Amino acid sequence: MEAKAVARTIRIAPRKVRLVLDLIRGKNAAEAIAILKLTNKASSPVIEKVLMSALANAEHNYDMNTDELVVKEAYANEGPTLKRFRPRAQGRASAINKRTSHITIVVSDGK
Amino acid sequence: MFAIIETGGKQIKVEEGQEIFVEKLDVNEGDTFTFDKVLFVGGDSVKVGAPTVEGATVTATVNKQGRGKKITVFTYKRRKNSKRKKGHRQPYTKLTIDKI
Amino acid sequence: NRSAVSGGGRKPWKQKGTGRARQGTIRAPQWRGGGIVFGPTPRSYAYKMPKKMRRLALRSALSFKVQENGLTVVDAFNFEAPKTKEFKNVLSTLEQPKKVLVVTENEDVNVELSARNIPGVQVTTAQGLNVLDITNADSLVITEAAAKKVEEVLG
Amino acid sequence: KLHELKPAEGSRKERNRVGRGVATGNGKTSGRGHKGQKARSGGGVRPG
Amino acid sequence: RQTFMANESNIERKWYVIDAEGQTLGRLSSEVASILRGKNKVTYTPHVDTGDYVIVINASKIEFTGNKETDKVYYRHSNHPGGIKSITAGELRRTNPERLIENSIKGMLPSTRLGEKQGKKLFVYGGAEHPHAAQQPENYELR
Amino acid sequence: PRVKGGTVTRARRKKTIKLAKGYFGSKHTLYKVAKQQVMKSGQYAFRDRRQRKRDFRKLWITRINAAARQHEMSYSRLMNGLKKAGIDINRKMLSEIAISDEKAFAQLVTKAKDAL
Amino acid sequence: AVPKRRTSKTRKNKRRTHFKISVPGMTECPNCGEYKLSHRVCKNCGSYNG
RNA sequence: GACAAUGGUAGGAGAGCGUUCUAAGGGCGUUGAAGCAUGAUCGUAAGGACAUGUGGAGCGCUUAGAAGUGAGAAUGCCGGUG
RNA sequence: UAACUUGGGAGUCAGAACAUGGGUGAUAAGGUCCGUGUUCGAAAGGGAAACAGCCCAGACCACCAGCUAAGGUCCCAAAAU
RNA sequence: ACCGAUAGUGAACCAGUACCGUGAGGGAAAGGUGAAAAGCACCCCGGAAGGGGAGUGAAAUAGAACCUGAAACCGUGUGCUUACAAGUAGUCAGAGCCCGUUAAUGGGUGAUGGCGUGCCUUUUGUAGAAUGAACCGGCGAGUUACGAUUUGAUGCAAGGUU
């Protein structure tokens, strides 16, 4: 079939996460662990979690071989933002957007 | 082997077994209509072209009678609050060509 | 309106020198939560017309029933106490359509009560004939006495 | 016949309702012309 | 309704060659821009190029009427401030005749993509020679 | 009563957003540029229906002229001879004789010369 | 200065063409078996062997 | 039939469309109402239907009546997002 | 084919260019102020390259029909090398 | 023939409250799971949050952020197309390629050719380098009362009317 995992309302701006997700999209899932494990970026650990969960949804509760698995569809959507404030000078105030993201990964076996 | 006829204020080049869309004739569905105004005939075997030709007039079926797609005529004047929208659907009849 | 909505009475910012539009109070029409510009006023709708036209209309409303077979005279009813069973039975044994106007001479107790539970039966007296309710119905039930009342009254 | 009701012919009109678009005729300036004293709300030389 | 339109599948293109000896620049350029643009075919359609492939030879033998040998300056600006350069039809009929001819004819074609692609149908050569022998160049003459 | 009408605004704004699909970028998404582009589109269409009768005319004349010059005639003298000979086909629109049946076009050219 | 005119979301995505980030440049460890980062020490199991 | 007219701002005149509620009439609706989305439908325009998904409980049609009755501009107001 | 009277409802009171008769200015001004006509205003279409006011001409709608007006006919660009 | 959550009281909800001000004083925002909490036992990934199953339920894309769920905006994939071109972004003509409808002179895309300087306001005159609007959605401007007049309609008519 096609297994998927989701991480809803992660506290990272989604267009910082799309950077990392544009690396693992379409890779043999045996690579994608190591790729996410070796890169500088910060959105990589909280995607390693989601990937390993979507791969532990393949062996368990379905029955798939987790060598035969490519990362078919990874992506990230916007969540609810936390709008804060930052005092500029002279009485001004500038809004801040602590944005979130929903990280969705779907691994398949090509069958 | 074609013929040039004139039906609705417009010449038309026609051959044997051709569909034509002409403006709204006065004939009904199915009943055959024979064009009398022929301006040219020829193509392959004869060549008669004249101020007009008496004979071999096109015998053609009257296949369908309907209304074309709706154009929406719109025109406006800028900075002057003056716009106008009409709709239009041009009636036509389609004929099949039997004989020349 | 602007006067009645609570608050207001302070200019939210200077007339000049801020980037924003010049605004008078927080309770103007366009402001969310503002006063309403025009709209519902507490008022009345009743008017009148000449008396002759009243009598003319109330006679048209009955000539229409006589044009049709809406009218059907009967005698004074008889009841000891109000009961809707016999009343519905009488109404059904007279080929009457659903809504009948039961016009009695004077106000009656043994008829109003046994009639006013039914869906479409309206009892009324010659003192209370209505252009609305003659035409609402399509079947009259008057008594042999109230009819003379109305012809003596109506012109 | 309380569901077929026709008033006399010529006895009722719509009210003119200005300020509802250019097609009605009285849309933008609502019949008042352009700038002036007779184009303001409440603005009008008193009678006589 | 019915009116013919030429396609990429429908169009055939012939080659022509024409001596410029004894010719005037403009009087040749007009009759050649017509052939390039392809409006002597019967199947002329505006949107596709039904034109032909024209070869011009003996471009060192064109003529100029009146005092154009020294007048009739060609100007061109390099887009640098003060970068305007000047030449004359005399100093170009002998120095680079196959650009004289090119400019004269290419100012006569419309300035669009189809016109840009139609201008490169023109192959201009001084002297009576040309490398386009494998094309079966047909011999045209003006009128 | 209070007429809090909000179902009709959306409906006509949809009907005008959907009349501009295929337009570059924001022109097919936002009501206030899509509406302007639909107005301009209707105006251009009104104008172009008039010009489409003027463009094909010049096209037909171009091609009839290209055909007649092969027989060594102008367009002008061809049409003069035609109008003078009585032979009065829709000679511009029927630039199809020149392509389809070329021998009949030689026919017409010879009649045109005979009228001179 | 201020932008005179907002950036169309086509020009935004054109400017963001080169904002992609590159692969880590990794290899397979000849001892760990798992992946290492070339010229670095295997985080997973042990030595560097160089 | 025949003939005439049919550019148009300020402005005058006329005929209509649609929303909300009411009266009367006559319907539809868990075998699926409004609403939303999709379409290549119908009318001269405002507009109307139909099929299809989603939705899960009210809605239309006829004739009249009554209006907080129609939004693209007010450095409008409020919210959301670029 | 209008004219007039009686009534209901108005908007308008910043006009412009060109041609012609003048004042003022310097026989300056796309100046300014009057008479006279037209066009724009409130007018789209063809021509004057583009160009409210110049020339032709007044759009009910549709047609891949014809005759023409100003203006044109070597190529751009329809039609006379 | 009143509102129905930007409406109706400022306040449908712990509202004269957060909050703002030395003070007098100003003052919001905030409703809706389901018929019934039956509010997700147990397993798996994970530090947890969050998920995927199994369940409850008529329905879980009804999971307490809980009816429907639009637009802006942000994404993922693909059918046509685009790296010699001077673009108020469209309209008319049109090859090619790709599909197949409220079945009708079909829908998508668009090589190339013609024409073409947004809208509103104010002006003699604005493509205007004059104004206004980032976008989207909701709210937002000739009304009511009592009098005068003029018109049409109706009832009577030297009477008419409360």
Side-chain angles (χ1 to χ4, degrees):
Chain A
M1 195 184 287
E2 295 173 355
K4 67 178 178 290
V6 181
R8 290 182 181 175
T9 309
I10 298 300
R11 174 70 190 88
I12 298 170
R15 68 179 295 261
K16 294 179 185 292
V17 169
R18 294 186 175 97
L19 289 175
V20 176
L21 290 179
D22 290 327
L23 290 174
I24 64 167
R25 185 176 294 117
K27 297 290 185 181
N28 202 169
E31 293 185 355
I33 293 100
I35 286 174
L36 296 171
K37 286 180 67 65
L38 297 168
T39 64
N40 293 112
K41 294 288 183 179
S43 301
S44 297
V46 73
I47 295 170
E48 295 177 356
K49 294 286 188 182
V50 176
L51 185 67
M52 297 297 291
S53 297
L55 292 174
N57 288 320
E59 288 181 352
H60 192 276
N61 77 19
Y62 296 171
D63 287 333
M64 295 176 183
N65 202 166
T66 63
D67 298 330
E68 296 174 349
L69 299 177
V70 297
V71 176
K72 183 175 71 67
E73 287 182 352
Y75 58 91
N77 295 320
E78 290 79 1
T81 61
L82 298 171
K83 290 181 282 292
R84 300 287 182 263
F85 292 99
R86 175 65 61 195
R88 296 296 88 195
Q90 293 178 355
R92 300 297 301 271
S94 293
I96 296 296
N97 295 315
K98 289 187 182 292
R99 290 185 175 89
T100 63
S101 64
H102 307 296
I103 306 166
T104 300
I105 296 168
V106 181
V107 297
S108 180
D109 59 356
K111 293 184 175 68
Chain B
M1 180 64 205
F2 64 91
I4 295 167
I5 62 169
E6 184 175 3
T7 66
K10 286 179 255 74
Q11 280 70 6
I12 303 166
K13 183 172 75 70
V14 62
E15 294 179 354
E16 67 278 14
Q18 182 175 2
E19 296 174 354
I20 63 170
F21 292 91
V22 185
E23 289 183 352
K24 178 174 70 68
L25 296 178
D26 291 329
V27 294
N28 296 116
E29 288 290 326
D31 295 332
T32 61
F33 185 76
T34 61
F35 300 104
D36 297 332
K37 294 293 292 183
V38 60
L39 299 176
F40 187 84
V41 314
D44 60 358
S45 68
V46 299
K47 264 67 182 298
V48 298
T52 189
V53 176
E54 176 184 0
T57 61
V58 181
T59 298
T61 311
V62 177
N63 192 358
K64 186 178 178 69
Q65 183 175 0
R67 295 175 67 188
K69 64 185 75 173
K70 184 182 285 290
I71 68 167
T72 176
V73 178
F74 182 79
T75 188
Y76 78 107
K77 295 287 187 179
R78 66 185 175 183
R79 289 185 297 268
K80 278 70 181 175
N81 290 319
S82 175
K83 65 186 181 183
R84 182 179 64 89
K85 183 194 287 186
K86 307 301 289 183
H88 185 73
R89 290 173 64 92
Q90 184 66 33
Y92 67 93
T93 61
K94 67 174 290 187
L95 282 72
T96 301
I97 300 297
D98 296 334
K99 301 301 289 182
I100 295 171
Chain C
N1 62 1
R2 301 184 68 183
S3 293
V5 178
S6 298
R10 180 185 294 171
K11 194 173 184 70
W13 51 79
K14 303 298 288 184
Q15 182 62 238
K16 295 290 293 295
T18 64
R20 304 186 71 181
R22 70 263 190 101
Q23 299 289 321
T25 63
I26 62 170
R27 298 284 191 264
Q30 69 270 13
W31 289 81
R32 175 257 176 88
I36 303 298
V37 173
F38 304 118
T41 58
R43 64 185 172 92
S44 178
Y45 299 92
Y47 59 91
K48 65 178 289 294
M49 63 183 174
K51 290 182 178 292
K52 293 179 184 177
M53 301 179 75
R54 301 171 191 171
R55 283 174 283 171
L56 178 59
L58 194 151
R59 294 188 295 120
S60 295
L62 293 169
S63 295
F64 186 78
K65 299 297 184 289
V66 168
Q67 295 301 111
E68 297 175 353
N69 200 3
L71 188 146
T72 299
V73 182
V74 296
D75 286 334
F77 294 103
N78 290 323
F79 296 97
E80 189 67 28
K83 183 64 72 178
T84 304
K85 292 297 292 295
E86 282 186 349
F87 186 74
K88 184 69 177 293
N89 292 316
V90 175
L91 293 177
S92 297
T93 61
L94 298 179
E95 68 182 0
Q96 296 296 108
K98 180 172 70 68
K99 290 186 268 72
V100 304
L101 187 63
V102 176
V103 171
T104 180
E105 177 180 358
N106 288 316
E107 193 276 334
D108 193 354
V109 292
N110 285 321
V111 178
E112 64 171 359
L113 299 174
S114 67
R116 63 94 177 270
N117 204 172
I118 301 169
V121 174
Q122 291 185 357
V123 173
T124 181
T125 190
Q127 184 70 41
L129 291 171
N130 287 318
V131 177
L132 184 65
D133 295 327
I134 304 171
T135 185
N136 202 171
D138 50 358
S139 183
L140 286 171
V141 175
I142 51 87
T143 60
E144 187 176 1
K148 296 292 184 180
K149 297 290 289 185
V150 300
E151 278 189 353
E152 294 179 354
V153 177
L154 288 173
Chain D
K1 69 177 180 63
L2 190 59
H3 47 86
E4 289 93 3
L5 295 172
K6 295 292 287 184
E9 292 293 326
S11 299
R12 302 295 187 95
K13 284 77 176 176
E14 73 180 1
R15 67 171 59 243
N16 203 174
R17 203 177 79 214
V18 299
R20 299 297 192 272
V22 300
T24 63
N26 297 119
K28 174 168 72 77
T29 53
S30 299
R32 303 178 80 97
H34 291 285
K35 299 174 179 179
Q37 183 169 1
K38 285 190 264 71
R40 306 285 186 259
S41 71
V45 164
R46 287 180 178 180
Chain E
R1 297 187 66 252
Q2 70 265 15
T3 294
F4 194 80
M5 290 295 172
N7 301 322
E8 184 171 359
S9 297
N10 206 167
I11 300 167
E12 66 94 23
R13 290 176 174 90
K14 295 305 295 179
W15 290 79
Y16 297 107
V17 65
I18 186 65
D19 287 336
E21 284 184 347
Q23 298 303 113
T24 304
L25 184 60
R27 303 281 177 173
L28 172 64
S29 299
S30 296
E31 188 75 25
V32 173
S34 295
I35 296 172
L36 290 170
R37 180 168 164 82
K39 69 188 296 183
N40 296 113
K41 306 289 184 67
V42 181
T43 307
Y44 176 76
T45 64
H47 57 274
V48 301
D49 54 355
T50 64
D52 291 327
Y53 287 146
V54 173
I55 299 170
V56 178
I57 67 171
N58 292 119
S60 299
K61 302 292 187 291
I62 47 85
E63 299 296 328
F64 288 101
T65 56
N67 291 320
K68 299 180 183 178
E69 190 269 327
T70 60
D71 296 332
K72 183 65 179 293
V73 173
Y74 293 99
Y75 296 97
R76 69 183 184 274
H77 197 273
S78 68
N79 288 110
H80 292 273
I84 188 164
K85 290 87 171 66
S86 178
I87 194 63
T88 62
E91 291 179 353
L92 187 64
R93 184 181 65 247
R94 76 182 69 185
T95 298
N96 193 0
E98 66 277 19
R99 185 179 66 80
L100 185 68
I101 300 296
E102 289 177 354
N103 294 119
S104 297
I105 297 168
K106 288 181 180 178
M108 292 180 180
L109 298 171
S111 299
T112 56
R113 304 188 187 186
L114 191 63
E116 294 177 354
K117 303 291 178 67
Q118 289 177 353
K120 62 183 72 176
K121 294 176 181 176
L122 180 65
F123 292 145
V124 185
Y125 295 106
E129 296 299 332
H130 58 83
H132 303 287
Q135 309 301 325
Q136 280 75 243
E138 294 177 350
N139 188 358
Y140 184 81
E141 293 188 356
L142 301 178
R143 65 183 179 86
Chain F
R2 178 174 182 264
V3 176
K4 65 176 291 181
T7 185
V8 182
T9 313
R10 174 78 282 176
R12 66 174 181 80
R13 289 175 181 167
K14 291 295 302 299
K15 288 183 281 189
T16 298
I17 288 170
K18 285 172 86 290
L19 198 60
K21 69 173 178 62
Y23 295 181
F24 187 88
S26 296
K27 299 288 179 64
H28 74 271
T29 303
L30 303 174
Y31 175 71
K32 289 192 288 188
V33 290
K35 180 181 173 181
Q36 296 176 0
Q37 193 65 254
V38 172
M39 290 192 288
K40 296 286 287 185
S41 175
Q43 186 69 46
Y44 287 159
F46 181 81
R47 187 190 69 196
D48 291 328
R49 282 191 291 272
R50 304 297 178 100
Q51 288 179 352
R52 178 171 61 201
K53 301 176 176 64
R54 293 196 280 114
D55 290 336
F56 285 97
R57 179 70 179 270
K58 291 186 179 182
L59 189 152
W60 299 334
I61 291 173
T62 298
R63 300 193 296 181
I64 298 167
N65 189 3
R69 293 288 177 91
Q70 292 184 358
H71 297 86
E72 294 182 354
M73 292 183 71
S74 300
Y75 173 80
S76 58
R77 291 290 183 266
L78 179 66
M79 296 303 290
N80 194 3
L82 288 172
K83 182 69 71 176
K84 187 180 293 181
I87 178 66
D88 196 358
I89 67 166
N90 192 0
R91 184 69 274 278
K92 271 77 77 175
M93 168 66 200
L94 302 176
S95 73
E96 299 297 329
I97 300 169
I99 298 170
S100 301
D101 194 2
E102 191 175 1
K103 304 302 293 296
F105 192 77
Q107 296 290 110
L108 289 177
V109 176
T110 58
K111 282 179 65 69
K113 287 181 182 290
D114 286 333
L116 293 174
Chain G
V2 295
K4 192 69 175 290
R5 180 65 55 196
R6 76 175 185 177
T7 293
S8 178
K9 64 185 180 293
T10 297
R11 193 183 297 274
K12 181 172 74 172
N13 293 321
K14 288 183 179 178
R15 182 183 66 246
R16 294 178 184 174
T17 299
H18 297 280
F19 185 65
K20 71 176 179 68
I21 64 170
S22 63
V23 298
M26 65 181 182
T27 62
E28 298 175 355
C29 180
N31 192 3
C32 299
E34 296 295 329
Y35 293 100
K36 66 187 287 290
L37 197 65
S38 66
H39 294 92
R40 274 73 173 173
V41 179
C42 189
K43 296 286 92 176
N44 295 322
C45 291
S47 295
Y48 175 68
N49 294 116

